[model samples]
Target chain A: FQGHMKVIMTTKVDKASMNIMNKLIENFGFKETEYVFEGNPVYKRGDVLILTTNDEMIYYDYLDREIENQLGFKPEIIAFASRHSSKQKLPALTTHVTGNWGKAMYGGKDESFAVAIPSAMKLSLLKMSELNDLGWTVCYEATHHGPTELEVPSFFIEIGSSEEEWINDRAGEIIAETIIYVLDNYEKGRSFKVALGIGGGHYAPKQTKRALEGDLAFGHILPKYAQPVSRDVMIKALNRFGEKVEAIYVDWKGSRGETRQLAKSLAQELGLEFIKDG
Target chain B: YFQGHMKVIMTTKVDKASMNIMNKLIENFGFKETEYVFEGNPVYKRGDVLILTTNDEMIYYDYLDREIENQLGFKPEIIAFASRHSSKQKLPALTTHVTGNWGKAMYGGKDESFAVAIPSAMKLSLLKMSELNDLGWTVCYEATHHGPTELEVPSFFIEIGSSEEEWINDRAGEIIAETIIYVLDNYEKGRSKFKVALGIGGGHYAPKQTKRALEGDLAFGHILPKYAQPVSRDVMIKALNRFGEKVEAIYVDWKGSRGETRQLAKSLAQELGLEFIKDG
Candidate 1:
């Protein structure tokens, strides 16, 4: 089957930066879920409820519980808590971390991941990061791969360490709310990765469409050798990223004015859409 | 929940007694045979063929096996509870009357070990052939799949069962539920692509055929790794990088019955691309 229709969005945002995320989510009718940290942080503390996308998805992570805005719900956002936030910068940090050259030869030992995006997807990525302040970050593999030869055209995000104030707060309700809001708001759906251009990477939204596999790479990370820009390269990038990528944070950028203008112009020109930040 | 990503399959043979149990339950419980849609039905609906396996051989195992293999290869992990159908070293379930397959499909994905569920009968038919012909695909009949067990996604087939057994057995419904959940879980686990896709198959499928097919068109220019001598992964990786093409996916089918072989195949597949298809 040709499967479901979709809109993919990628954004990067932090807790402090995404203050009004919950409000935007509420305005957009996205449901909310709460993660009450009952136990100590030592064992299994904070509550993390996951709400996946639904059939007629108008929300990302919705909760049946009442959501309060401007409260502790919207806290400072960081990227991933599961080791991607590590300090070591390597291409294969996780494997190299164990100090096991002999043992690490197994699965995940030389674990590698790379990103290649086109100009349009890169632009959408910018908008996503601008609005939601949500994108992948890692302390995970920055360790072993030397982190220097890592030249795949991809962006990353990181936020507050374990020492940060609000993040350290046991009752960080706002943090959960902000995340839930971004996910819910952006989860409203956008399937257009295929950014259009009038010329160069400059696409005209209405005239644009997503590219197909093999037209190029999964992302629009085209070669920079500067060969007259092709829309084919851009569309190829969107399709490369796939049509089903989920948006963790809807409104990534709280400030960055040029980014906001860029987002508007990019969205308008390439025909790319997002879970509008109501 | 049927998000449809990874898959798992438990092949089994249901005999008279075990199937009788299923019949009794359908009469007792509201075991309805319904057509469910997992992904989406934007315009025309995509359908999954659900069968309540019957006692007939030609129709059930033989025909069903071919039907499923028409789309894929690889013998199924048997979970037979009914008849062993001795011709093949089929896998049987602990209880013929109460094993399940759909349940296994639920949690199947790349993260999990196994995926893809087919009937043992299908598996048996597949094993009968030493080498696949046209598509270079082997045939695994429903007979290879047996009683209650599970699988992961990155697996699917042309036809599931010939009859509506999942409808008659209460346990079978749970199996279906598992399939739905596994599908969704996999949807969440899908990977982002690079520049190219690679298909690695055991000699059984002549995976190189597919590669040659791709390269002949100049879509990609590629070569296979040397067999015994200098057969480390580094050579292949170097080949890939030297090709300077972003590896997309690798589809491989090999001939090996050992569990270690299966694990090795999977490991190799994961190294090259996120979506590795070796088993069915």
Candidate 2:
């Protein structure tokens, strides 16, 4: 199906990534392209390009610059279809911006952050919540991991918790459908107020609830686990949002007293509304 | 007698509290006029301390330390700003604290910046105030807040609080004046041996931290109140770095702080290799 032509979809050869990619090809009828990426054939439908990668997405830190060099054009945004592993192993569908808030143990540079696509991720979350039929938790994860140096705004939509759910066809279909739905509808979703979320758990339950049921779209989120976030890093996170962040949503009870004050102070400094949520 | 190189006692003509303290410093103590003048006001000296008066509000002077250095051609060891403290409760109090803004600078200086803190001096002032107090005034440490955050050297405020009645009280003025001199005299003698800590989570007045500094072995540097909770790791590090003495521990007023704050304080202490002391 024809969608936002400026969008690029990427997937690794892993089970979960391929699961979602195959569902997209089967349902949407993407055509093979003469162009190749990383020795794999590139597929295109309308102006949207889908590339399969031999390496994991997080290690593809400078993939955006490489694509721009190869194709002579940069996609307005990139969406990664990937697997989310957790020690808890609960079934879940998750979306989040990528970058380590603290260390780069997983990927990317230490203290580096990637740009965030708020409206698109918000739409993806909304569609996932509505279309999710499999008994899975649909939510947003706190900003984590890599591919942090991308020039364009990006996010990941994943099948999470364990390998059992990773290769699940229904879960893959839901993510595939959600990605396409987001690409088609995200621009329209920009009508909602965009926000930088601060002070919540890694799952960002409060922000996810607000996104799914309220009128806010979130960009980079600073979780309480990443506490002691410096003012410079916080400002960097704010500057990396693709959309103009209009407010800061703080999970009051979930955050530290200093974090709450920092968010409020930043809100006042930037002329953004400071919202308190559970 | 001299304590260190030279300490500065600053007063402003605009503040009644400052004038009251200035009157006591000159009358009760043996301060003599010096040849130096700052903005046309005579500078007074006694031992290793020099007193100067400014025509404007003390809080508005961002680089007063540097200005003094420029005028005198030598940097003073520390600066003590004698000022008035206003509170809605009208509680009779004598307070002291380093200048800073945890978030934004509403009064003066840069936002999210802290001045160096003299923990031993502050601890000595608290103890001395307690000793000299007779009016049943609340003597405590206020949280690190407000401006004059641009000073390079360590500085603190010694204030008479609540209303004009307390601000102009002769006994309260004498208590603060005496406390300032007593702290400068004994701050480095043996008070530095007290365990220096960065206080976390209390009221604006930092009641628990004040109590600990008065009676316990802890000498507090920067005190972050509960209202300023969730202080970033960088700012916490900044506070520790701003201390005139080495900060050996992070003291959390446990019950006054939330769980997340307590967790953060504990983790930071571990990361920085400092003692994590909890007081309920």
Candidate 3:
């Protein structure tokens, strides 16, 4: 972790969040700390700080700054152990940055983005893929919602879609293990080609495949729903990456022609490679 | 002239575009030789404007303004460089823009630094070119990019663009020469009484912002194009602060900008007490 402190956030009210937090304690020897945050006891393991919140994670705007105010130091990165919910209620494991491409219906300022930690998300996804035996669909979600005003780079590692998957002990265990693996190994002198993914659906199917099987580490995956994306917006997404983006990978078949043209033009102007994948 | 003083026009001997524009200035205007020599080259005088020739590329002279003040023993009120623009597309263009780098200092100037922008002069020059344009060339503002960013006084570049064919075009050269002289003389009296704005969100040529400036009452300076999006808040504030005139508003090409960018522009406008004008 480059001598940097890593902070993991979980909510007691969230089943999956607590499940993963419990797994971290039982399996990774995260001991109790004297520090208390918002009436809950804090946990510590080496350079990592585990804080449990009574509220939902998405509504915890500026929580990173609050943590810095109380702990006397800011985290280099934050990982939210979260439960993903969807109307379709599919069983899956996922990871993504938090932000709203348009309206802020959930828990952030409208049209704002949280800084994205690409390497950590990439490592978490790879680890989740390696540890999966339950046949759950593992993937990355497009950028959405919030807790968007965080100063530290952040991402959510989740057990997703409906109560069944949210409380599954095995799913919780996999996510917990993945978080630990990412914290331990992400920045251990390994450099990955960082990229911003444009196109695809909210699930970002193409980007997930690239992350799992390819050498590129994706920061923020903008879905096709966020189409007609402005060059300014793309650059904003690019600037939010913890790593410098070397290329823009557009899901050619999944995006609009205008979006593809915008991406290609920006890539050319910024001197970055424009990669097209279906 | 700005502040009741003369302006400085610079050209380079090695660059064909520079010499072509210089030749037009000499032929069509009253330019006589002066005893002054800058870098072993003779200077030309025409009314309050002085033409100085250099042997190197104009972009590399980071503090050419300060060097002129030291060597010539007087501060130049404003500077204009007659230069050339290049693109792989090779489209014929008569372009104008101020100098600075938004990200890295690949050509010249410090990274994230901008030269002071003279909105009145730039606006006047664009309007004049549009009126005098007979060659069916594209006339617009290039996004604020490139070097010579360290000067104290405001500066802008007027260029003949794309290929050597357009660079050496006699009519294109004459139009630029006439436009530069007209702007130098009329920039103050011709200043738009409309709100001065820092343009946000457009392509490199700033077509929408250029249109708004020419067709509307807004004068623009330091346009941040789409590709240069996500300029840091501090840098955006810096560019706004560096404008020669008080920026009264932030003019955004709404459809050309992302939602977050619009949001940022609005919030910054609110914070800085500047109006947030949408696409015209």
Candidate 4:
């Protein structure tokens, strides 16, 4: 609506959930706005920027960006609160997920959800911090699902615990509370992750934890010897996982450099998290 | 609503950014993934094939081979890789025997012979050599980084400068590209023999170039282990699964050289029905 318009998207949050969230936000120091209309049997907020989203998660990203790009309303921030998680089992419930699903889900040829989520979450987290001091904090390390990035005046509440409680019912009051919270706390953003990583191999659970702790977005595995079997195995492994990476880097050496560089270059080009020994 | 006739193909075990890099190789070089093949083989393309380096090293153990595409071509038709050499070691036995390495083209076109300069470069015989049948593809013990050596086969091996010089290593990309383009141009003109070729080294850079080469309709290929050592059956089988059927020929000359290799080839022929001999 304006320079720092507090855009709010309504989830299926029910009246009970809405009341709970409002109590929480208010306790955390914030004033809320409420509007009742003669639309459906329930009270509907009459805000020009009220967006209703069902379950489709990624569309929310496109819709928000398009509006911003099209309307020329470069709001200080954009928010993306959703009711569904992209997580799934190996043979998950998603028909097009485990293997088959393609652009039908993303509306494009890009199957980069695994890699895109991390970036999105960090940005959203920063935005949420700029907008308001949310009453709760959560974090995830996987590439698929996580919190909103933290760089703007945005608070993306996922209703993370929506399983037992279909809090996705009273989507209106939730928006009112959100708008109020953003308008109240207008501080700059900050990131929670701290450390970073450089060289490493197949990280065990402990090492993976350390990387997350270090806030490292990426890294590489070094080579010990130039055995033919080792080289061949590494070759297949690199290319196989090269789909998600962009470019890889390798340190200096003769055959090792050539071999690693070739592997890294090819992997990066194919689209995988390219990492090389430096 | 609009379409011309550009194609991208893959001849590797799996596809990924490495394979995607092949797009540049297609644009930069003449290698193709799968549009036209040489022997009308269904490995990747129906005929022409994807050929060019990095078969022995298991570069892609995570994902499958990828299909390459560009702004101008069809969304890439097919993918094929050297199955025997797709992993770490050379495949001991298979249906047919592969002969000739990158220098073979030079040898086929030249009158020179190849001798090893980087002795440490070679570890053992290449993968998938049908020892008894496959000639012109013999490896002289530790002749650095095993590939299908042509002179040893019924074919020839024009000694390219030597992998010893950084010049060869640095300009390897250009050299392979040039050779691939030449071969394809000739094939398109309909020659009597296919003279299909494949290079089995340059692990990282190979996928893109090979992918590009395949799409450009260069040549079909099979995997062969780096001469790191003579790969056993388990290792060979792993390479086979990853590379697939296009590895029409096997070429091993380590440990047991011809005897063990031929036995393995015949056994593979029983299952895969590979030709096992030159033009079989």
TM-score, chain B, each candidate: 0.22, 0.96, 0.96, 0.32
Cα shift from native, residue A207, model 4 (Å): 9.6
Q: lDDT for every model?
A: 0.25, 0.83, 0.84, 0.29
Candidate 3: give the clashing pairs.
Answer: none
Q: Which stretches of candidate 3 lie over 4 Å from their true place?
A: A1-278, B1-4
Give the DockQ (2 decimals) of all models: 0.01, 0.01, 0.01, 0.01
Which stretches in model 4 have alpha-carbon errors above 4 Å?
A4-8, A13-61, A65-72, A85-102, A106-162, A165-212, A217-278, B1-280
Model 3 residue A172 distance off true place after TM-score fit, in angstroms: 42
Model 4, residue B253: distance off in Å is 85
Candidate 3 per-residue lDDT, tens place, B143-259, comes to 899998898898899998877888999999999999989989988787758678988875677777777877888888898876677777888888898888889999898755656
**lDDT score, candidate 3, position A233:** 78
Q: Give interface RMSD, per candidate.
A: 23.6, 32.0, 27.5, 32.9
CAPRI-wise, candidate 3 is incorrect
lDDT of 4 by residue, A1-278 (tens): 34344344443433323433332222121211232211211111111233333444343434445445544454444344443332331110000001001122333222222112222333333333343333322232221222212222333344333343224323323433343443334332323222111222211122233323443322122222321123344443232221132334333332244555555555555554543323
Q: Candidate 4, what DockQ?
A: 0.01
Q: TM-score, chain A, per candidate? A: 0.24, 0.95, 0.96, 0.37
* Winner by TM-score between candidate 4 and candidate 1: 4
lDDT of 3 at A105: 90
TM-score of 4: 0.25
Count of clashing pairs, candidate 1: 145
**Which residue pairs show collisions in model 2?**
A228-B233, A257-B229, A257-B230, A258-B229, A258-B230, A258-B231, A259-B230
Listed for each candidate, the true contacts retained, as a fraction, are 0.00, 0.00, 0.00, 0.00
